[model samples]
Target: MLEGKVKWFNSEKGFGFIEVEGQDDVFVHFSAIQGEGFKTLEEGQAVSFEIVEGNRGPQAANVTKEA
Candidate 1:
């Protein structure tokens, strides 16, 4: 798993990017979020997740909000 902060997100668009401390941002789709309700994220919010190949390039998976 990896750790990062939400760079920006469009809940309506259902996609966003997670900023890694020392690397390029990773793509995040609502579908990649793991929870029980609507999936979304907030700018600057911390999170923990895994990385994998996406439709395009780097992507985030199993994303969960951090404390």
Candidate 2:
């Protein structure tokens, strides 16, 4: 798992990007998010995720928002 901060998120779109502690920004879609019944995320929020190879670029696999 990698720790990072929420760079930006679109509540309506249910998608966002994350800047890993020591990696480049990663693209994330709602499908990448873990669990159900989650709304959009907020900026500067703490999160942990598994980095996986995406069709486009880096993708956040099984990402979960952390307190």
Candidate 3:
């Protein structure tokens, strides 16, 4: 899993960006969230995720909050 911080989120749009360590921000969508409800992220929150080459660019997959 890759570590990163939540750059920002648009709960209305259900998308966001993650400031991945030593890399550019990765696009994230609510679909990637690893939970059933309240799919969202808080800015600056630590998270773990997998990077996948998306059609547009690098995006975060299987994202989950860091314990």
Candidate 4:
């Protein structure tokens, strides 16, 4: 599990960027949030996720964030 904070989120678009605790920002989508239930996320929220390299940069695989 990776500890991080929500850098940005677009509820309208259903995606966001998470600034990992020690690393850089990573892409996260609604679908990426597993088991937990939430329609959207917001900035400054705390999250735990797995990091994976996307075409552009790092992205979250199993994402979980708290409101």
Q: Report the number of the highest-TM-score candidate.
A: 1
Summing lDDT over every window of 10 consecutive residues in candidate 2, give the lowest-scoring window. Answer: 32-41
lDDT of 3 by residue, 20-66 (tens): 76888998999899866799998897999998884777788999988
Ranking by lDDT: 1, 3, 4, 2
Q: Model 2 scores what on Cα lDDT? A: 0.80
Higher lDDT: candidate 1 or 2?
Answer: 1
TM-score of structure candidate 1: 0.90
* lDDT per residue as tens, model 4, 6-66: 8999999999898865667788988887664566788888888898775876678788765
Which of 1 and 4 is the better model by TM-score?
Answer: 1
State how far residue 60 of model 3 sits from its true place (Å). 0.7
Count of residue pairs whose backbone atoms collide, per candidate: 0, 0, 0, 0
Sort order, TM-score high to low: 1, 3, 2, 4
- Taking the tens digit of each residue's C-alpha lDDT, what string does model 2 give over 1-67? 8888889989898888988767788877778777668756788888888878846766887788888
True-vs-predicted CA distance for residue 13, candidate 4, Å: 0.1
lDDT of 4: 0.81
Give me candidate 2's TM-score against the actual structure: 0.81
Please report, in order, the local distance difference test score of every candidate based on alpha carbons.
0.91, 0.80, 0.89, 0.81
Please report how far candidate 4 places residue 5 from its true position, in Å: 0.6
**Candidate 4 clashes between residue pairs 3 or more apart in a chain or in different chains:** none
lDDT winner? 1
